[PDB]
Each structure stands twice: as structure tokens, then as C-alpha cells.
Amino acid sequence: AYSLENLKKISNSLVGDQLAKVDYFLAPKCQIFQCLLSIEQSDGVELKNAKLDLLYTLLHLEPQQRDIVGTYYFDIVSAIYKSMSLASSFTKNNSSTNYKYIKLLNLCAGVYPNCGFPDLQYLQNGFIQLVNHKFLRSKCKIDEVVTIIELLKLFLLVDEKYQDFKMAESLEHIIVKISSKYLDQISLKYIVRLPFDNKGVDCTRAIPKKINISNMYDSSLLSLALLLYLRYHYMIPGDRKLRNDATFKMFVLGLLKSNDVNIRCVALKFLLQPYFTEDKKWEDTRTLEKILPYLVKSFNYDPLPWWFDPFDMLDSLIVLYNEITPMNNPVLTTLAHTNVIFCILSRFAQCLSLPQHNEATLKTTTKFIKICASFAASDEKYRLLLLNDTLLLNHLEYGLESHITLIQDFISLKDEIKETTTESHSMCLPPIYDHDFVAAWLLLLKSFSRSVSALRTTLKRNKIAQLLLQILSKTYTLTKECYFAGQDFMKPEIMIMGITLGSICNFVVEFSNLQSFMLRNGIIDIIEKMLTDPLFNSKKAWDDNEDERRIALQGIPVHEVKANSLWVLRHLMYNCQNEEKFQLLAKIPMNLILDFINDPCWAVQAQCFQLLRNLTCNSRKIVNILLEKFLFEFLAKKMRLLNPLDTQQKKAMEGILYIIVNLAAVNENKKQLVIEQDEILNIMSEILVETTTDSSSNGNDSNLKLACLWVLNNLLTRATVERCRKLVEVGLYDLVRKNITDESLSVREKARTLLYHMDLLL
């Protein structure tokens, strides 16, 4: 606890011995800390190094030793973050001291990450200055290079939820100044069908020879610089960027075949980021075809960096081509043609049936379940292929029952748990260890439920429906009664609810057996309870008792549940008589539906409008109820505000147009009422004018054209002649006549028959 002679001996008597290390944390010897981590801006440069070495040695404990020592360890770590004055003088300290301090900081962030580190900007400034001054001018020393390596490693770990420009510039300069030494190793011979160095064609299916980096420091620097540059560069404007260059792209493709695993992983990440970020890049199947073999080959290397995850990228690619262009998945075809789909399915089956599980195996199984759900998203082939097993459904029910049992056990023991866990963890409680597993199972079930054949022959069980209802009720009750666990415990369960409502909304549709089952067991009551909660319906008020609940659950995103609730209600009223209509309206009155009409989420608006359509769909009474419940300019304003270039917004627009269609058929009075209003006629005129040459406004769509033509058809004894003449005067005869030349047979036939009827009546 004194001069260097003592500290060096203590350090040399503390290497690899956990017993003395954990003994130093006991009361008689804790006095060493009062001198060890109280480092002023004095006392030589050897003393600082010795103290930092001693701190690094002491804090090196295996996890069970950490459990033995207790909270004093984390108190020491917090004191390291908050009461050490070396980050501020980073530019003034000696290089070796900086290296040792950064290594200590890396260990501290790796052992106890939740504790806040308040001095990042000093380190960013020091890093930028150091690299921009010393490194790029080649007047560098060994410790400075290693310090840059450590700083990059530390910066990589940050969560992140003007100096950015300087950091991006420094990183790109690093990348160029290190890679320029190796560009002359690129080689690629190819044959193109119709001198050299033209580079006319690079769609040749082959990639250059491997590129090997001899220097290890160069390997580390290149890898970490590429990773962090990937983190920053898209928020930086300008032209002639690094990502868009051709020689660099060839360099990275060559790097794919290297030996360093980190190099291969970072090359894969750099090459695959544009698909998720850049737009229209998804129509570049050649690059995916020439890349995918290495992404597949990456599953086999044992020591993998923590920032790499082949499962997640493969799942993201599959989800991208499922979501944007279904019925054609180049990843799925490329995988199925080359036996790897079967290997994945077999490994899923093997992992599902191990004799003994633990945490790691549970996570692996969760990943496999998610990827298998991704396969069966938009292809009946894999749906039936997975369902030919006749053993998945048992495991599905087992997992759902396990989660239900855990939730029941928690809700039963609510009072005792709250009483014994309110002083230390008042609103900070970990989530249940089962959330991801049941989430993956629910995704798989939702993917299965899209095929009507499966809904009618192999998913025609009652246990599934009962379990779904139980999960919904239990999760909402847990939200209601146990709001003392904060957001960290609450967010996963709300996610589960959002997934399960969407999985239900397929079972409840018509021409499915289980609709009567769900109606008998009362989904409407549960949805009615959820729709009046002030946590969901934002046009209500909280009582005097719920203030703690509101402040505990203020910052949680809840719109999937609202959208799926309205979705289920829509599916409940698809092609049904007036008895069920009036029953549901007796339970849920019109006020709630009209209250969900101005939500700031577009999906909620779309689902509300579609439900309104299906509600007024062939009903002479509910149209009167809706008309009384308000008048028309709201619909015109909605159609004017909504952007037809957006999928959900386009769905909302189609919903409103068909609401007008249903509105203009109840009686002649309604027909004249909708004829009288003039703005909507202007929207129809703006819709119909768009053609192949002019596809700017409203995107030149055919469904909207058919909807407008249907509106016009529904508008048809002298009053009818007057309306016909008014439509002719407003500029509709010319529009329908010019529609005869469109590119889709449906609108052509509808236009010709409408024109004939109009002329015949006129």
C-alpha cells in the first residue's frame, strides 16, 4: 500500500491465484484501495502504471468468485468509473498510462455494463486527435497503435440506442491509408459474351482470389475500422463515397476468402448492409447468388466474434424477400436447390429433442424455431412439409401451457413478491425467462395459420384456441395487476399479446371451423376490456388510483395490439348477417370504433376504416347509425391527406372509397346525397386521369380505378337522368371513354359496359 517496491511484490504475488485475490476484498486488507484508486495528477509515471496494473490484476475474478465476494466488487467498479481523473487529461498523460487505463476500462465495461460511464466525449476527442496527428503521418510508436486498437474495441461495445463527422473522416482515412498497401493483389480473369481494364462486365458469377494481410495490427485495425465506419457512414452526406466505389467492392469480395475469421465476418457485414439500408438494391440477385455460399459456410467456424450472428442475417434476408416481393424468394430457391434447407430442418428436429437442455440450448432452439417460421411465411410447400411431422403441435401446446403456468404462479404470488421486493427493485425487475421461446412458437403458429387447408384438416383443434384465449387473458391481467415491475418486465408480455392477437385473427375468419369456438368462449369480451383501458384508448381518463400504473407504463409502444384488435373485429364481421352485427354492436358500441379513427398510427387508421367498411357492408341500418353518429368533408380531408404511395395509407384510401361505395347504395336519398357533394368528384377525376405516361399522382393503380367505376355504377326516374347529365357535365363521359384504352382487361370491360349503360339511359 506504499512505494513501488511494495506494489511490484504484491502484483507478482497475485497472478493466477483467486484465493489471495478474494482475500484482498476482506475487511483487514481493504485499506489498500484507499491508496490504490486515489490517483492525483502527480506521483511520477511509474506509480500510476503500478497502481493500474494492481487494479487490473485484482479485478480478474471468475464468476463464482464474483458471487462469493459480493457487492464490494461492483462498488470498486463504480468508484473506477466515477472517481478516476485520467480521462479528462487523456491528451496530457503518457502513452503507456493511457494504454493501461483503457485496458482497465475495457474490463470494467465487460464485467459491469449497467453502471453509467460519464466521460465518453473526452475519449472520442483524444482518439480523433491522436489518430489524425500521430498515426496518419507514420511518426507513430507501438503503444499508440495498441491504444488505438483498444479504443476501437471499447467504442464498438456502446449501446447507442458535429463530432460524428470528424470521427467518420478519421475512420475513413484509417481505412484508406491501411488498405492502399494491398490493392495490387486483386486478380480476376473472366470471359464476357457480346482490350482489358475496361471493366465492362462484372456480372461474371466469380470473385477474385483471396487477399492475405500479413501484419496482425493491420488486420485488427482494418476490421474494427470497417465495423465502426459501417456504424457511422450513412448519416454523412457527400458524393464519391467509399461504399459506392468499384475497386473497393472488388477488394472486399476478395477479402471474403481470407483466413482471419474477423475479416470474413466484417466483409460479409459490409457487403450485406446495402440490402437492408439502400432502396431498390433488392433487385440485385446476382450479388446474393455469388455471396450466399460464404454466409452459409460461416456457420461452421467455432470461435466467432460476439458482433457476428449468421442466424440473424439469414433470417433478415428471408424476411426481406418475404415482406417486399412474396411468391418469389431467391434466397429460398438458392437454399432449396442445394440441400441446405433440409440440413436446417434436420438440425431443428435434432435440437428439439435433446435429453437435457440449458440456457444456451434453449436460445439455439429459439433461433431455429424463428428461422423455420421464416421458411413457412409465404409458401405452402414448407407449411405442408413442416406439418407432415405430426409432432410439432404437441411441443407448441407444451410451450404455451408452460408460459400460462408461469404467469399463473406469478399472479397468485403477487402480494408476497411485491412486499418482499419493493425496497431494492421498486420498479426494476427482470422479465420472465420464457418470453422469447413462446414468442417464437407464436410466430410459427401464425405462419402456419395462413393456409385454409391446414385450418380445416390439421389445425382443427380446440386446445390451440383455448390456449390462445388463456394467454391473452392472463397477459392482460398481468398488465392490470402487476404494474409495479416497470417497463423492463412489461415490454415482452405486451409484445407477446401483439403477436397472439395477430395469430388469432386468422382462426376467427369465415370458412374456418374454430370461429364458432372463439365466439362461444367470448373473444369479444376480452377485446372490449382491452379497448377501454386508458393505456390503450387515448381519449379516456385515469382514475385517482392508477397514477402509479400510468407513470410506470408511460413509455411503452402499444399499436400492434390496437391494429390486431381492429383486425379481429373486421374478420368477425366479414360476410355475416345482421344478427351478429347487432350483437357485437351491443357489446362494443359505435363510440369506441369512432374513437379509434384519429390515432397517430397509420395502421390503426387503416384497420378502423376497413372495419367501418365491413360494418356498413350491406346494411340499411348501420349506415343510418353511422350517419347519426357524426359529416362528409372529413372523408375528403382524409383522402387528401393520405399518401397513396404508402401501403397502409393505400389500404386506408381503398377502405374509404369502398365505404363511399357502400354508402351510395342504401337508398335513392343516399345516392342523391353522395351525388351532391362535389369534392369527391374532383378526387375521382384526379384518380382516373392518370395513365401509363402520367403515373405520378396516386401511382396509376387499378384497384382505385375499379373502386371509382363501382361508385359510378352504384349511382344509377327523372332524377337519375339529371344525375347522368350532371356526371356528363362534370367531365366523366370523356374520362370513361378514355379508360377504354387502359392496359388491364378488367377496367376496360367495366368502362365499356358503364359507358354503354350511360349512353342508353341518355
Binding site: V69, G70, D409, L413, T420, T421, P430
Partner: protein, 136 residues
Amino acid sequence: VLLEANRISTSLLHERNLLPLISWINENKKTILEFQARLQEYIELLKVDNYTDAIVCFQRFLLPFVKSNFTDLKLASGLLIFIKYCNDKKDRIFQHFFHKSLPRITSDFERYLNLLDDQRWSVLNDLFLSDFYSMY
């Protein structure tokens, strides 16, 4: 009588948990019970923290038995070290629900366990019983 002595020895092995009054096996084999009995004495003495007598008996009664069997001596010597480690609401709530453990506020030896199972008493008594029966 044969049966009386057999029952007394079996009870002393089973009911009581002490090896003495096994002197017959100690002085009459002349034809693996001796080595097993000596090893059981060693382990029984080492179960209590006594060491010096354990070292003496190891050097005295197990040293000559090295030519035939060697692995069991290795296991015994390893136990001589590993004995100190092999043998012996909120936390229950956290373990059952979240699979997490709070810090305490302070601010694969399967072979060795097999060498300490109490079934060794039963198997040793069984071996003595079988030898005594087949020898009379």
C-alpha cells in the same frame, strides 16, 4: 455359533458405521476385501479433518498394495486434496421465475463423490457376507 458371529459382524458393519470388529478379515484371507477394508478405513478417517493418522495409514497399509492396483491409490491421493471442496424467499422467487441470482450484501468430481457415497458401506458389507458364506 456361525450364524451369531455372522449376524454380529453384519450388524456392526451396517447398524454401526465402524470398521473395527472386522479382525477376521484382517487376519484370515490366505487365498479384494483386505484392500477394500483398508481403503474404507482411510476414507473414513479422512472424512473428519484428521490428516496425520491418514498419512500414516496410507504409508503403512496401502503402500505394499501398489503393484496390483494403482488407479485406486490415485483416486485416494486426489481425494486427499479435494476433500475440502467435494463434501459439504427472495432467492427462491428469483431462481424459479427469472433464473437470476442477487449478489450477497457484503459492503465434475463425480468419481470423488462415488468414493464418498454411503452405499460403499452396503457394498463392503455385502462383499464380506458373500466371502464369509462362500468360505463356510
